Design a protein that fits this description.
Chain B: It comes from Enterobacteria phage T4. The structure is cut from a larger assembly and holds 4 copies of chain A and 3 copies of chain E. Chain A is low in regular secondary structure. Chain A is about 10% helix and about 5% strand. In chain E, a hairpin with a 5-residue loop joins β2 and β3. Chain E is elongated, with a radius of gyration of 13 Å. The chains are: A little secondary structure, E alpha+beta. Chains in contact: A-C, A-D, A-F, B-C, B-D, B-E, C-D, C-F, D-E, E-F, E-G.
């Protein structure tokens, strides 16, 4: 590093109409699979969360 | 158990810049290293027989 | 006397449990919060009985 | 005793260039961008296609 | 709180004139307040940055004139 | 205070259901809170930054989960 | 008596902090015990050899752990 204090960006692919939101799931995540129906039924209806 | 971990870190460029009494600061010496040079000594022992 | 300046950094995405990072601007200097036992790239295993 | 000072090691104070000392530097250089790579498909040999 | 960084200032009390001391004080200042106005030189300190206050008396983002009272209060000489 | 900027979110009370509403809510948010997490889309707002919050309800640097409950408060349905 | 040489050390007490002292201790050490183990640096002393010990507390050839505990004892802080 030639100048003090480097920096590195990070581009998250975030979905749900808010690239920044509270708990906006990340799109392409090695951990986390893509939400199975988001493009699909999950746009037509909203499913009850499980708790 | 991961309770007490093991690290090595730097020195903040605010502390390292003024080190051992610069800019009015005080009590903060640098660390130093010496060398020692200690010696050993041996002796010759005899041995012998007859006929 | 000698002087050096180096500084260390954590890979962005190191933790990689995180949906999206907090604050958008996040020190890459290692610390307790981000860098302790959370880095995905490295997995430490103590062996015993050798 | 003009001091160089440091960024506070805060993440903002670096990205702004704010510095405890005299100078406020430009910015945190750039070390380049880190994206999140795309996961791999399992393709379709496992399930008959029939377009 | 500060939400950015703290510049911790630790001053060492020195004997100045007859039966008098310049009181050594430990103080933690929010960094963007400390960078804007800080008076300390020749004050026999040692300063270190940190992300949470390392001393009891803490000066947040908003003091200014309250810290401008304290930053030059380090030269107040108690008998 | 935020000391940075206040992002002012103004939602317009609309009639959602029979004799019901989504109440019009005028709220200011500290920019470094708003830039980190903001849920606004399809919120029927108009948003302007300022150096001093423009509304009585104010969410400063430190709320987070108090705003994260209040950012999705803009879709609340009322009788 | 050590019969070889005696390294005579005189340490000069000082005010370390507010109403605190680092106790000055005059001491002497057998030259071999001194060359073997001596911890004195930054201790505000002055040291001279002599055929006999020139100070009250004298360490002959065999003390060791009495002096190894004593040489580091010069940094004990008293009020």
């Amino acid at each position: 590093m030639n100048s003090p204090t480097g920096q590195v960006f990070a581009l998250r692919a975030v979905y749900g109409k808010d690239p920044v939101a509270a708990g906006a799931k990340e799109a392409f995540h090695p951990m986390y699979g893509p939400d199975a129906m988001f493009s699909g039924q999950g746009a037509a209806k909203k499913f009850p969360a499980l708790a | 158990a991961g309770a007490l971990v093991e690290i090595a870190e730097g020195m903040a460029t605010s502390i390292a810049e003024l080190q051992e009494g610069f800019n009015g600061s005080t009590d903060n010496p640098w660390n130093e290293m010496g060398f020692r040079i200690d010696k050993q000594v041996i002796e010759a022992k005899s041995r012998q027989l007859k006929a | 006397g000698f002087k050096t300046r180096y500084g260390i950094g954590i890979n962005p995405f190191a933790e990689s449990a995180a949906q999206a990072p907090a604050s958008r601007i996040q020190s890459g200097m290692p610390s307790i919060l981000n860098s302790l036992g959370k880095n995905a790239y490295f997995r430490r295993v103590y062996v015993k009985g050798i | 005793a003009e001091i160089g000072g440091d960024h506070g090691y805060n993440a903002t104070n670096i990205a702004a260039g704010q510095t405890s000392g005299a100078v406020t530097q430009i910015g945190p250089a750039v070390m380049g961008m880190v994206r999140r790579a795309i996961p791999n498909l399992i393709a379709f040999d496992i399930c008959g296609v029939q377009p | 709180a500060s939400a950015r960084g703290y510049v911790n200032i630790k001053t060492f009390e020195q004997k100045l004139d007859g039966n008098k001391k310049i009181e050594g004080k430990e103080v933690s200042v929010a960094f963007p307040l400390y960078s804007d106005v800080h008076k300390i030189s020749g004050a026999h300190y040692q300063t270190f940055p940190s992300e949470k206050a390392a001393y009891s008396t803490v000066y947040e983002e908003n003091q200014r004139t309250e810290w401008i009272a304290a930053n030059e209060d380090l030269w107040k000489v108690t008998g």
